[PDB]
Amino acid sequence: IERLQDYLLPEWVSIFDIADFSGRMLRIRGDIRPALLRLASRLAELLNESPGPRPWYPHVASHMRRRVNPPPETWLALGPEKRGYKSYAHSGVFIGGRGLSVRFILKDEAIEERKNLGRWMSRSGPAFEQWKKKVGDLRDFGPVHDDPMADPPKVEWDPRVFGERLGSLKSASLDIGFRVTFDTSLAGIVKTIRTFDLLYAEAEK
Ligand SMILES: [Cl-]
Ligand SMILES: [Cl-]
Structure with a gap:
């Protein structure tokens, strides 16, 4: 069974304990990048x-x-x-x-x-809430963009207002999803990505 750890080694989390730019970048570019390309x-x-x-x-x-x-x-x-x-x-x-x-x-x-996507979220709050319930532990990674070890909060905002902001402000953004373990199967990760299809599709039009 193919798993994430066959590509991304569990110990590589400690690369992110390297505080200096050059030292961390050497490892990100040299070791992690080729693995991410294979995995992608x-x-x-x-x-x-x-x-x-x-x-x-x-x-x-x-x-x-x-x-x-x-x-x-x-x-x-x-x-x-x-x-x-x-x-x-x-x-x-x-x-x-x-x-x-x-x-x-x-x-x-x-x-x-x-x-x-903002227009869809605004117009389809109940559908977003249904989807959120189905996918379980949906987190908002936006607020921890400056706190790398902090557990990201659960998504709790009103999708209608979040959608209105997301659609109208030049500096707005979305980054939502799931923490996963290194031993997760690729088959499971593929299905996780498919659960975003509703949002992925609505973003197009
Ligand atoms: Cl799995
Ligand atoms: Cl682009």
Whole structure:
């Protein structure tokens, strides 16, 4: 049974205990990146075995923007475009000092897709709440973006107001999902990513 730890070694969480930029980046780029590329490819193959409402193409964080503060986490992204991913909805598998997580992301620069998903959330609060109940322990990673070891809070906001903000503010963003263990099967992770399909699809239009 293929598992996340076959790609991302459990001990790699300690890379994120390296406080200095150069030292942490060396390990993120040298050791974690090749593994994330392999894992991203494999997850995309598995997802594409049963097509969903949008394509999934693999990407890996480039870390070309950081200078002084090392990344608190690194990730692969699965999104609808072959090259680039930050301008569109995507799912990601992340590793940092806290371990692994699987999240659904709309960055501030995904202006149009935030407008689309925000409008859906605003108009479909009850459907969002139903979905949230079904997926269990949904966390908001937004508030802990500056607290790498902190347990992210449960999503408790009103999706209608959150959606209104997400759609209308240039600096708004979404980052929600699940903490997962290193021994989780790839088959289980694929299904977790599929549970974001409702949001992924509604972001497109
Ligand atoms: Cl992009
Ligand atoms: Cl599993």
